[PDB]
């Protein structure tokens, strides 16, 4: 038979074109290759991890190199308010002279792309000032990428392959990753901030030439070893400091001020230094918890066996969970993906509201692009967390090792779980859609004073607790006679109060009944996606329609038309149905984010507060209104710089629509069509001298679902990316 794929002779003996696709698709599923043991599994995963690291550092070195060669960084740092950040130059021989003139914007020789990734703001805040610095960084990270690719090749070699005991050592890996990978890395970044990034913002160049002969503070290490640590908070940066120069500067390296730098509208470098120093100490201290080869330390299996409550209300508690987290990679992968997805949501929510980098939040397209980019990344990672949890249930879960613990008791009350998730999804859907349709009927019949406008009094109460004097609750940070106010008032509250009472930033935006309705729609999307994903995880072992679902695996097509027909019965198919709800939910949160920020940036937040309460106001004042300059990117009168985003907008609509073909139409139609094509080719003279090596067949059911979801998702992403970038950049 054939050689490809080498990991599966069952696929290598396939005479069809299914072999190529299934070799492409089952390549990185190492647990199901021929002759795979457990040590070999962990070793190939370790090498693949090194490959991922090398690709990430090559990606970063490429961003640095293309900025350093084809951008305007050294010209951008002189006036970062009026100059657009260039990503990379364009060489497209399919262009015409109007397109070359249109994408030749300025100040550049030829056609360029204008970056919306925030890298100029990030690099300028961390201390880059010249192009050479970016060249040195690019060469350094390319060398680091080569070292990690070499280290993957090296740790594949038989004198360097680690044993199974090295991979299954959890206490040593948590101590080294908490203390070293979190704590020492955060401490070294604090060192970079204090030694380089703060004096570069003071106007003093501290490169590799003079970082040993320039004092970070006029009394170096004498307060640090005397204990007089408040001597590094004395004389901070003045509220009339021009960033990157020496006018209005100070001497402090570690403050705690709160709020924002006044010019850049961004977090203080001294506060970020103090922040990374404090969390560095906390992670280094937390990295001495677990028992390595030194007698002291905690034993995780002992902790888990101890935390079982009395009265049997959790049964056996956490008994036997160490041997099920340790032995399963899908449990660990689902935990890692759940944490990293929630942290990516945290990154987006905290970076729009608390912008860190200098002259971020004045680049509105950068704000919108970074928020939307980490929100969609977070949604995909959360869906993958639940997917690999269902894979954990099918492949790795041993019930006799878990007889009575929390993981078995979840499978015991799975019906109560899915029932109450079904209830909250139905409730939020009926009442959110009913309130929007009610208000639409009121807006249609000319009576806006009848529409149900519930005030978000709970979140307004929370904003008043945070120190916002708009809603008049006046308690705990908004009342001047409070203990929390009076205790934090001397040191960090005077900046936080000014920044939260400024209504010209994203720090705790003013909310109203539209914000109520959209947060309810967000809860609907979250609960519903959680319903499909939890149902797919807990019905993965089997259901009453199919008791032996664990015997077919994770991703099987169906179980046939018997028993009333069983389509999309698998846990993979439940994931597949939940990717749609993920895309819907992130589309809701980013429509909401983008329209509330466009109405903040234009100046009329009254437009959002009036039109946000009804879906015709949505469709008219956001989607119809902000796509006026997008679709005029090219026309029969000419073109301009938005023509690439108009073309990509139509491109995304097309890929979405092409995905609907695989989504709606299914296999046997196409199999009959391909059989008539096979007849036509084998009967056509002077073309039947050419014959296929792989027998052409229609795409399988699971592959069809994957290809349709892939086209659907890529078109969704490209359509909203083109609309968001083009509307924000064309109107600002």
């Amino acid at each position: 038979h054939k050689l490809f794929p080498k990991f599966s002779q069952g696929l290598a003996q396939d005479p069809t074109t299914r072999r190529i696709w299934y070799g492409l698709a089952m390549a990185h599923d190492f647990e199901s290759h021929d002759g795979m043991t457990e040590e070999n599994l962990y070793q190939k995963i370790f090498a693949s991890h090194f490959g991922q690291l090398s690709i990430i550092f090559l990606w970063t070195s490429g961003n640095l190199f293309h900025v350093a060669w084809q951008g305007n960084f050294e010209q951008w740092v002189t006036d970062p308010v009026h100059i657009r950040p260039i990503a990379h130059a364009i060489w497209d021989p399919h262009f015409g002279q109007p397109a070359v003139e249109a994408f030749t914007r300025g100040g550049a020789s030829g056609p360029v792309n204008i970056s919306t990734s925030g890298v100029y703001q990030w690099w300028y805040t961390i201390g880059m000032r010249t192009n050479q610095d970016l060249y040195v960084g690019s060469v350094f990270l390319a060398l680091v990428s080569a070292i990690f690719l070499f280290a993957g090749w090296l740790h594949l070699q038989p004198n360097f392959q680690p044993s199974l005991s090295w991979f299954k050592d959890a206490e040593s890996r948590l101590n080294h990753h908490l203390s070293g990978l979190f704590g020492v890395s955060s401490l070294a970044w604090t060192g970079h901030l204090v030694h380089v990034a703060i004096p570069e913002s003071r106007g003093q160049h501290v490169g590799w030439d003079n970082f040993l002969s320039v004092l970070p503070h006029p009394q170096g290490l004498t307060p640090f070893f005397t204990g007089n640590w408040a001597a590094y908070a004395q004389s901070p940066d003045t509220a009339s400091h021009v960033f990157g120069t020496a006018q209005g500067s100070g001497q402090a390296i570690l403050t705690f001020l709160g709020g924002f730098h006044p010019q850049t509208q961004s977090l203080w470098l001294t506060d970020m230094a103090h922040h990374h120093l404090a969390i560095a100490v906390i992670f280094i201290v937390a990295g001495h918890m677990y028992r390595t080869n030194f007698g002291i330390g905690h034993r995780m299996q002992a902790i888990l066996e101890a935390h079982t409550p009395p009265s049997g209300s959790l049964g056996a508690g956490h008994k036997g969970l160490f041997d099920t987290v340790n032995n399963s990679l899908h449990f660990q992968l689902g935990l890692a993906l759940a944490s990293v997805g929630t942290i990516t949501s945290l990154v987006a929510q905290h970076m729009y509201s608390l912008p860190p980098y200098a002259f971020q939040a004045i680049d509105f397209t950068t704000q919108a692009a970074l928020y939307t980019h980490h929100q969609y990344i977070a949604g995909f990672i959360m869906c993958g967390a639940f997917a690999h949890g269902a894979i954990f249930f099918i492949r790795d879960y041993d019930p006799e090792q878990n007889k009575g613990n929390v993981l078995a008791r979840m499978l015991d009350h799975k019906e109560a779980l899915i029932s109450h998730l079904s209830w909250v999804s139905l409730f939020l859907g009926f009442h959110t859609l009913g309130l929007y349709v009610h208000n639409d009927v009121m807006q249609a019949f000319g009576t806006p004073e009848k529409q149900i406008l519930i005030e978000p009094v709970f979140a307004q109460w929370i904003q008043a607790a945070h120190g916002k004097a708009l809603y008049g609750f006046d308690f705990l940070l908004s009342s001047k006679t409070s203990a929390a106010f009076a205790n934090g008032q001397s040191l960090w509250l005077p900046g936080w109060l000014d920044a939260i009472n400024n209504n010209q930033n994203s720090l705790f935006l003013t909310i109203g009944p539209g914000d109520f309705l959209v947060h309810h729609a967000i809860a609907l999307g979250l609960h519903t996606t959680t319903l499909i994903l939890v149902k797919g995880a807990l019905d993965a072992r089997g259901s009453k329609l199919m008791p032996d679902k664990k015997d077919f695996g994770y991703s099987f097509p169906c179980d046939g038309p018997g028993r009333g027909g069983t389509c999309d019965i698998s846990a993979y198919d439940a994931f597949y149905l939940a990717v749609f709800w993920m895309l819907n939910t992130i589309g809701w949160v980013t429509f909401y984010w983008h329209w509330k920020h466009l109405t903040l940036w234009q100046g009329n937040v009254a437009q959002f507060d009036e039109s946000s309460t009804y879906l015709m106001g949505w469709l008219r004042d956001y989607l119809w209104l902000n796509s006026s300059q997008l679709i005029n990117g090219y026309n029969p009168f000419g073109m301009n710089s938005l023509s690439v985003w108009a073309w990509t907008f139509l491109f995304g609509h097309l890929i979405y629509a092409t995905g609907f073909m695989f989504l709606i139409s299914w296999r046997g139609y196409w199999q009959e069509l391909i059989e008539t094509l096979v007849w036509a080719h084998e009967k056509t003279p002077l073309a039947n001298l050419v014959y296929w090596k792989d027998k052409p067949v229609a795409l399988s059911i699971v592959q069809a679902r994957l290809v349709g979801l892939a086209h659907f998702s890529v078109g969704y992403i490209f359509t909203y990316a083109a609309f968001l970038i083009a509307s924000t950049s064309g109107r600002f």
């Binding site: 249609a444 000319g446 149902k535 149905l577 119809w624």
Partner: protein, 107 residues
Amino acid sequence: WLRDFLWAQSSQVIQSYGSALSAYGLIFLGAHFVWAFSLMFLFSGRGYWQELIESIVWAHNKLKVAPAIQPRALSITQGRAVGVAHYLLGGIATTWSFFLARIISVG
């Protein structure tokens, strides 16, 4: 077609609120909704829905309200039929509202 036909001529339907043509805006939105609602039936399959109904049936059994006529997910062919019917109704009614609002306001 996207700009000079759909986008340009959709002005009348999207700004029909507060007048006699407001019903065409309501049926524009409603038709968009029904069209989208069809995609759940067209893109999904009855195995998932049968298992979901199993969980819900459990919840009803817990409160002694499970019906004697047993809740079943729609058949494969009925899922397809419901799908295509809501798809057609949605799309056709959308173009209906667009057309009528447009031509009545500019006629």
